[PDB]
Design an enzyme around this catalytic site. Structure first.
Site, PDB file in Angstrom:
ATOM      1  N   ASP A 392      39.087  36.708  33.882  1.00 60.36           N
ATOM      2  CA  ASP A 392      39.973  35.886  34.701  1.00 60.36           C
ATOM      3  C   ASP A 392      41.405  36.399  34.643  1.00 60.36           C
ATOM      4  OD1 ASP A 392      37.644  34.049  34.831  1.00 60.36           O
ATOM      5  OD2 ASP A 392      38.237  33.608  32.761  1.00 60.36           O
ATOM      6  N   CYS A 426      39.648  40.970  46.479  1.00 60.48           N
ATOM      7  CA  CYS A 426      39.586  40.034  45.363  1.00 60.48           C
ATOM      8  C   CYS A 426      40.115  38.677  45.807  1.00 60.48           C
ATOM      9  CB  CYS A 426      40.376  40.563  44.163  1.00 60.48           C
ATOM     10  SG  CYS A 426      42.112  40.934  44.498  1.00 60.48           S
ATOM     11  N   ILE A 430      45.339  42.385  46.250  1.00 58.68           N
ATOM     12  CA  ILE A 430      46.402  43.322  45.904  1.00 58.68           C
ATOM     13  C   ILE A 430      46.305  43.697  44.431  1.00 58.68           C
ATOM     14  CG2 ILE A 430      47.919  42.498  47.734  1.00 58.68           C
ATOM     15  CD1 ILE A 430      49.310  40.728  45.838  1.00 58.68           C
TER      16      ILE A 430
END
Ligand SMILES: CC1(N)CCN(c2nc3[nH]nc(-c4cccc(Cl)c4)c3c(=O)[nH]2)CC1
Length: 494
Positions: A392, A426, A430
């Site tokens: 994460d 994602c 970026i």
């Protein structure tokens, strides 16, 4: 340009700067030193200093009380040219950037370097216009401006040294104006170059390149950058160049497309945006390129799934790379735009058919069949690789997990000749999206050339950042890029 970023500073020194030589509205951006991805926007207001936190877990710059931006420059430009305010009514004004005098984040400044190496690097790697600034040899405090001038051992070129006296905390070349920093001195003589009395011009074209090395020399260069760190100083020097990448993003800012961006401030550049024909034409995506090219887009919103498959179909994309989970950090990052295994779903005029899923260790491969709703329309195989191992926050501790994920995606692109760009995405598109593309670029260079040619990680990232805003977000991702290239070389050596 990005002088408001003080790289080597603590919070106590920023409060003293804004209270000494700053007025109400003066601001600066300082990095939290030993806390990864934590920046602070310090603004003077009502006689006191307000510290607004900026968090970057690897996907975007999260400004508390504001929005999410691709770079700090776009964060500053957005409030100096929307508006930032506290939760309780009072507005915060970003007015006057408090310029920084630290040259360690500049490309041309080396320091603790001698005329032995300065003339040496300027004679080997040098070129007409190349220059550098080093700490003085004989006058502790002064600096030397070494400039290469001429042509491309024929007596053609030369290296002229220009003494830069440092006195009274001001920098001068020994005659005329005295500047507040070395950056102000170099920037002034970049516009108006010096002219020696016999008619030669000391033009400061480009700084000396020191980040390019042989792809077999990778293990040593990492060892030099590992501890005194060089990784941090080489990355902040890359960060000081993002202010040159503030290009127009008008199409993403239109009222017709405000809701088509997951983050309204992280927008695609106009010169590289992906335009959609048939049907609007907008989708938050850019075209990346070094042949094999890429498409870097954001996590699909529920009103942009149909536009996402129109892009994959029209650009003839056969490989999709997903580098984030469906929900991370408690918030949605990318809606489910793919049908479940052994199923079919229709997104607008497109049709995606899940044939078989392959659950690997670090990722999940899905064999999809894309086709437009039409009579003589035949399906074509689109492969979705979903990387699920990436944490994460931060980066993985093993490049091999991302290494196996890339060479398998690479081979899928070779299996089709009419294939288009690879779609990497994602959350914002970026952070990890940029890290995956840059690593694959540097590796695709290596596998084709071997280990006996050059690679330049800082130049490759800046070259990709000029196509999509804020590619490769954090310094952990920057260091992980070197580790992945170093790890790919290690397997080729054995
Ligand atoms: C010693 C020292 N003070 C100066 C050299 N140094 C450095 N760090 C960089 N980071 N990123 C770049 C870069 C950006 C765009 C294009 C290109 Cl070709 C390179 C870059 C660069 O040139 N030198 C390390 C710190």
């Amino acid at each position: 340009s990005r002088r408001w970023f003080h790289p080597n500073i603590t919070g106590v020194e920023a409060e003293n700067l804004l209270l000494t030589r700053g007025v109400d509205g003066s601001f600066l951006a300082r990095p939290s030193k030993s806390n990864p991805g934590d920046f602070t926007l310090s603004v003077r207001r009502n006689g006191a200093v307000t510290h607004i936190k900026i968090q970057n877990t690897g996907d975007y710059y999260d400004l508390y009380g504001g929005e999410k931006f691709a770079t700090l420059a776009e964060l500053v430009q957005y409030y100096m040219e929307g508006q930032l305010k506290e939760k309780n009514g009072d507005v915060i004004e970003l007015k006057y950037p408090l310029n920084c005098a630290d040259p360690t984040s500049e490309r041309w400044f080396h320091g603790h370097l001698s005329g032995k190496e300065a003339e040496k690097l300027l004679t080997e790697k040098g070129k007409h216009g190349s220059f550098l600034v080093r700490e003085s040899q004989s006058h502790p405090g002064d600096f030397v401006l070494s400039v290469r001038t001429g042509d491309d051992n024929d007596g053609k070129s030369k290296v002229t040294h220009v003494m830069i006296r440092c006195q009274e905390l001001k920098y001068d070349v020994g005659g005329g104006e005295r500047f507040d920093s070395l950056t102000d001195l170099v920037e002034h003589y970049k516009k108006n170059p010096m002219v020696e009395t016999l008619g030669t011009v000391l033009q400061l074209k480009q700084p000396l390149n020191t980040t390019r090395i042989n792809a077999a020399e990778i293990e040593s260069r990492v060892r030099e950058l590992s501890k005194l760190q060089g990784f941090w100083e080489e990355f902040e020097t890359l960060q000081q160049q993002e202010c040159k990448l503030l290009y127009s993003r008008k199409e993403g800012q239109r009222q017709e497309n405000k809701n088509k961006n997951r983050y309204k401030n992280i927008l695609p550049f106009d010169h590289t945006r992906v335009v959609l024909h048939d049907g609007s034409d907008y989708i938050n995506a850019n075209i990346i390129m070094p042949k094999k090219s890429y498409i870097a887009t954001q996590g699909c919103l529920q009103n942009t799934v149909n536009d996402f498959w129109r892009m994959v179909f029209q650009e003839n994309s056969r490989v999709i790379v997903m580098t984030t989970k469906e929900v991370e950090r408690g918030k949605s990052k990318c809606v489910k735009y793919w049908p479940d295994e052994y199923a079919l779903k229709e997104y607008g005029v497109m049709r995606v058919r899940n044939v078989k899923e392959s659950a690997a260790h670090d990722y999940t491969l899905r064999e999809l069949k894309l086709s437009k709703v039409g009579q003589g329309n035949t399906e074509r195989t689109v492969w979705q690789y979903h990387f699920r191992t990436w944490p994460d926050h931060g980066v993985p501790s093993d490049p091999g997990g991302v290494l196996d994920f890339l060479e398998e995606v690479h081979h899928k692109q070779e299996s089709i000749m009419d294939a288009g760009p690879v779609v990497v995405h994602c959350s914002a598109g970026i952070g990890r999206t940029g890290t995956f593309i840059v690593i694959d670029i540097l590796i695709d260079i290596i596998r084709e050339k071997g280990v006996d040619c050059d690679i330049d990680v800082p130049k490759t990232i800046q070259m990709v950042r000029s196509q999509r805003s804020g590619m490769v977000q954090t310094e952990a991702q920057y260091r992980f890029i070197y580790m992945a290239v170093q790890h790919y070389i290690e397997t080729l050596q054995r």
